[PDB]
Amino acid sequence: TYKFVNMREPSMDMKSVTDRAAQTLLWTELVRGLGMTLSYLFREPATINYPFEKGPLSPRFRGEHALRRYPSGEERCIACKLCEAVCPAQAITIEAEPRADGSRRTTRYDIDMTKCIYCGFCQEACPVDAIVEGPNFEFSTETHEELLYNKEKLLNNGDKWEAEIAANIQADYLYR
Amino acid sequence: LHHALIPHGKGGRSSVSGIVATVFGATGFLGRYVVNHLGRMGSQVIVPYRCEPYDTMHLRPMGDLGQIIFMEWNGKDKDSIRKVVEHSNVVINLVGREWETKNFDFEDVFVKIPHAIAQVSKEAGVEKLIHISHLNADIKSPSRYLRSKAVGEKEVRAAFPEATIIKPSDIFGREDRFLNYFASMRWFGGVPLISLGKETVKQPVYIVDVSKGIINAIKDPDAKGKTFAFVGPNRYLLFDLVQYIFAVAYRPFLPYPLPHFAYRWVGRLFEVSPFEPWTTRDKVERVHMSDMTLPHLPGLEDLGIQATPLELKAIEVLRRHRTYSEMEDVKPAKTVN
Amino acid sequence: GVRTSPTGEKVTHTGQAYDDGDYRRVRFSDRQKEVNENFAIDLIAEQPVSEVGSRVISCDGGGGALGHPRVYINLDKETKTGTCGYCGLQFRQPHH
Amino acid sequence: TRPTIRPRNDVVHKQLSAFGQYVAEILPKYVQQVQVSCFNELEIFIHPDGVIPVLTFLRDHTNAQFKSLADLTAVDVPTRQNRFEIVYNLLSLRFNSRIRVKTYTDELTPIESSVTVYKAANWYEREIWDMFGVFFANHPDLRRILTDYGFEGHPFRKDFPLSGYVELRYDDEVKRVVAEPVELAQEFRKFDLNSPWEAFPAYRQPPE
Amino acid sequence: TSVKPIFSRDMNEAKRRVRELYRAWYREVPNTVHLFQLDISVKQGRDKVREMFMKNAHVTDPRVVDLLVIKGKMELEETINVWKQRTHIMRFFHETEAPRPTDFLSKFYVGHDP
Amino acid sequence: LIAVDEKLDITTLTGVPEEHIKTRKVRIFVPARNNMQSGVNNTKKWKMEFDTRERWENPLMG
Amino acid sequence: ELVQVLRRGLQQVSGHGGLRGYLRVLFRANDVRVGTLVGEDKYGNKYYEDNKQFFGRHRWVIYTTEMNGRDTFWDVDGSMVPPEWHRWLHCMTDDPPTTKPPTARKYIWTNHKFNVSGTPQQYVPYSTTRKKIQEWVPPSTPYK
Amino acid sequence: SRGEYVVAKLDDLVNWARRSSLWPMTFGLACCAVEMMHMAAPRYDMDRFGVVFRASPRQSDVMIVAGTLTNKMAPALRKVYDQMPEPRYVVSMGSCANGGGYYHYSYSVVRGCDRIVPVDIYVPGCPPTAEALLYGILQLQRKIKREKRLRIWYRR
């Protein structure tokens, strides 16, 4: 089906001609626009009082990256490099070697936050839920270098945001 | 050499040149050019600064990620000097000032600070020390500027025996105070000259050539404790040089003779400005002083740099001062040579 | 187990510390070196050893789907304890 | 029923096969091959010199009113003698259908421009030239469209490096942007992902 | 063996087109210098045009010559219409690149590159 | 249809620098079968690759 | 009526604890709305809720005047909130941390830190791996 | 010292005006520009902070590089940055402006606008949230609050 949007010939009778002439001489539609703008002026603004008020978010929100630990304190990452395999932007660099106790653990884990596109593929591919996208989004820096996170920075982020990240994962782990 | 100081790459922006250089007074003309060249070659530059961090913004694109490090230092603080020269194998000294402030004098900026920098660098294990001096450096010079430069050169040589003392004659460039000073004197009516400038001979040198010579001196192993003299290929009379500058700038050129005492009084008048002064008595003395000839000292040709004549690079500096750009040919100025 | 290197620099959990002659320590001047204080190896060593009465025991890291893939560990060799290698957890069979 | 397998339209497949036979019979001088894919797409492989006649016929014929040029692109296959493969996608609104015309061309062989038949061919052929080096003989204005001015090389060729040869940065000495040989802080990491086991027996090639 | 031509049937027409392109580029150097406010001289521009023309002097296939002159005409068209900036015109003159030595001893000293 | 006996040289048209045109030795080979696997599907097409050049470590982040 | 609005404004003036409190909340928060207090963290931030406001303005935080070693009377950041109150304020849940305390772990930070960019505490990257190739140390004994 | 007190108070006064009144020139090159429109939208209202919606390069103090900077576009960005009058600040918004983003290894992308202009603030994200960009702007404002131009000048 279809419809016409601008195919409607106006009537040529004297009443309609006089109405259109009055519309031309007396700015009726312009007055209508003014009235609409006045109504919007008297409406209530939709502005939040940032930073004292924050816009709504979701548990699925992707922000600053973090590396988690087990409740026992052992870090969850097992140096499997699915991160590096699946990262679209190749922003993850991983180097691993056997630990002093023989565990398979990372020695280098770097994320270039200036190269990452915050797509969330790394936390989908983790078999142990080690790397996550934390809810933080206010980590702006004054230098380019500060956005080149390493393993220590990511572990600090995980320890700092562990409560909120754990709550979000608990709330939204049944949809995955 | 340290395992991390071994050069790598093709000498680009992302390569390692093996040079860790602390550059004093990098927030200036020659310091800016030297930092640019070091960033081009891929070195690790440490920039001690005392001014606002906003004024150091132009030095950030010159280096790659993490190559340029900005640290706050104090001129009268050997602790800060050690902090900024602790991890560098090259130290470059370019601190200077055309005038004197209420807290720093010519002796303070040319004798005390360079001596402390040289002294701390020797105790910090710095391999190479480049110190910038002036070609017309003499203990009995009329100007306190040149007297203090000579005294500081002697003190730095005594403190750091394996030093390279570089003595440019007078540097002209985009941000120089030589060509900009000469071309901007049109405000004071006609251009004032002492004896019309027909008895003063100058040999100017390009900023790029000076920076390339400084860079080559670091890499060359034969310049460990030497003293160079960077001069241009041609020597010009002051009157002819100013006439050529005004011809290139397409400005009306009317020179008038001014007595020496009158010119010194005029320079004294401008010194009262709390801001940067247009001219000073020492600057007038240096402008009307001749350029010393030192054939014994090696130069740009010895370092492998061919000096650029002023005729080629004059249009870059003086195109800004044109008012109409004016697209007319300018005859080269005759050189005494 | 944060230990200080001879140059007065903290050593990370990966045994990272710049040498005395390394120029790269200049980046930490007037700034700080980011080191995580908690060491996972030390914490997992502090964790005790669970004893169960079976030859094969299953570990999923706790929490079910929030842990690691479920693995089965054979508690036969009495010389050592069977270690789940995802979480690094030790299980043992009673002896005395 | 099979929920996870896409349905098949034998009626549309037969219609496309019949139309392919029709056009092949009508134009024996240029049509080299006719194919119909299993997802109901008609492909006509023609000689490179019959581009204008074939497109004019497929635009103006009463039973073949493909008035709309959907797309125009090229594919670079280095192993072939004629590496470049110009593809025309045509849309017929009268019969609600799409057709695909294929042509082969090497580096030094020009092709007749289709700006006379379709007007979108102007910019499409400009882009093809800019990105591959394929030259179109009768183009009103052929020049680079996407690449930077003075750019050397054709990026979409399979022999052109991903990061190119030069990069841009601001040089304070000259007070302008300069072009210097590329030098990556971190090299692009090439991943070998192809499995050593054959996945589709239907496309297996003869052992040669 | 036998191929279709682009513009020239043989090498004489290709050489004629090369001469026409050289004339067109030669007559445009002072205008390019004036419009872009380049710091180079007209002689340097003429020498650079000569050098660019002389680096393809070993080409013997007429089709390659035709493509080269087509690309040269495109580049001249970009310059005349001031579509490019001073940036590209100076990109023709390698000015910020360090002089790479071409001797075995220096290449051995600098690194592993052949 | 002109006649020519040239060897189809597109060196001046590719746009590659003369350094990377004249100082590069490529290897035309069929890749060897990976010993860790028994599949032979990756040893059917010829591969052309260039010679390995220098790769150093970034001063920052290594 | 206008009288009712004026009375509401006067009540808001009285609701902040007189005139000094009203002026303080006006100048350092740019809003003088009053809402029920939900809780307070260990740093001094006070979290208020008022469900009568439209979505996005029904929860807010008044920041403390001093956090860690920095005077934050005027310079207040959005990163000064602890993670649990951060989740509550950003509305990922309807449960305040007082009602639903977060799970306690031995590795979770006890003291929260804001963005430390531009400060001596800023993060500086470095390589976390050891040297790849060990060089050969020459013997310390002369051969002749 | 009375002189020290006066220069400190004048520095506080001058920095307050620049911090409160920001007139940014939006260099919207790609998808990151949409988030700037959403920051200017009624919900966040960048105008209420003293940050004008848009301004010409001559009257602008902050350049917000939001988008992928290509080789064909870098000279124009440098030209407008030069045309901006000092004091001038740069906020690089998004991964493309910060580094290379999704197009880091492309032949036609400048890997970071910091290779062309000195960047004052880096805002991470793809695209950064409107709240993230507002936080970056407020961080720039607090950075301006720490400027000590007159204090440095008086101690020269």
Ligand SMILES: CCCCCCCCCCCCCCCCCC(=O)OC[C@H](COP(=O)([O-])OCC[N+](C)(C)C)OC(=O)CCCCCCCCCCCCCCCCC
């Ligand atoms: C109707 C009113 C109309 C006018 C309204 C506006 C005027 C009133 C408000 C003015 C506020 C001051 C603004 C000045 C500019 C500051 C920013 C600036 O431009 O900085 C750049 C420069 C910074 O200097 P700089 O030399 O460090 O610059 C760095 C180097 N470059 C140039 C490369 C960037 O500011 C100055 O130079 C200003 C210095 C002079 C101003 C006065 C400062 C000292 C005041 C106290 C003196 C002593 C008092 C006690 C003793 C008295 C004895 C009598």
Ligand SMILES: CCCCCCCCCCCCCCCCC[C@@H](O)O[C@H](CO[C@H](O)CCCCCCCCCCCCCCC)COP(=O)(O)OCC[N+](C)(C)C
């Ligand atoms: C036409 C030309 C006009 C000339 C006018 C000349 C008169 C001078 C102008 C005076 C304007 C009023 C003074 C500045 C108002 C300060 C407002 C105050 O609230 O700012 C504080 C900032 O205070 C700072 O410490 C600086 C104080 C301002 C400067 C005062 C200087 C002393 C008065 C002027 C003295 C002039 C020199 C006298 C020498 C003898 C805190 O605000 P803020 O920073 O946003 O942080 C809160 C952020 N929020 C809103 C999101 C929560």
Ligand SMILES: CCCCCCCC/C=C/CCCCCCCC(=O)OC[C@H](COP(=O)(O)OCCN)OC(=O)CCCCCCC/C=C/CCCCCCCC
């Ligand atoms: C100060 C009080 C404020 C209260 C009002 C609030 C603000 C209202 C302002 C809203 C106006 C919006 C801006 C208007 C800008 C555009 C105005 C406009 O378009 O008017 C042009 C309009 C039509 O132009 P077009 O249709 O585009 O041309 C096509 C012709 N076929 O032409 C006009 O001249 C408008 C008419 C103005 C004069 C009206 C006079 C009416 C006739 C007077 C008859 C009485 C004669 C007196 C003799 C009496 C004998 C007893």
Ligand SMILES: NC(=O)C1=CN([C@@H]2O[C@H](COP(=O)(O)OP(=O)(O)OC[C@H]3O[C@@H](n4cnc5c(N)ncnc54)[C@H](OP(=O)(O)O)[C@@H]3O)[C@@H](O)[C@H]2O)C=CC1
């Ligand atoms: N330029 C010329 O014409 C010639 C110069 N020279 C010499 O070369 C050297 C460099 O000259 P040039 O760059 O042109 O001059 P500038 O005045 O432009 O640069 C001087 C540099 O030293 C710093 N500086 C000045 N005073 C002090 C101080 N008290 N404490 C700390 N840092 C200070 C300045 O930093 P800040 O921003 O804090 O002021 C600036 O970075 C000088 O020694 C000069 O004598 C020799 C021959 C010719």
Ligand SMILES: *P(=O)(O)OCC(C)(C)[C@H](O)C(=O)NCCC(=O)NCCSC(=O)CCCCCCCCCCCCC
């Ligand atoms: P006679 O016919 O012997 O002439 C001698 C040569 C060697 C030219 C012969 O004609 C000859 O046999 N040449 C070999 C084939 C040939 O003609 N090659 C030339 C290729 S055309 C070409 O390369 C033109 C493109 C160059 C464009 C240059 C761009 C200008 C740069 C200017 C930069 C700065 C200007 C301000």
Ligand code: SF4
């Ligand atoms: S979010 Fe996407 S682009 Fe970013 S690190 Fe994860 S996989 Fe890579």
Ligand code: SF4
């Ligand atoms: S996917 Fe998980 S276990 Fe694998 S490397 Fe990434 S964080 Fe580690």
Ligand code: SF4
């Ligand atoms: S950072 Fe992401 S959202 Fe921003 S311009 Fe790049 S691709 Fe677009």
Ligand SMILES: [Zn+2]
């Ligand atoms: Zn387990």
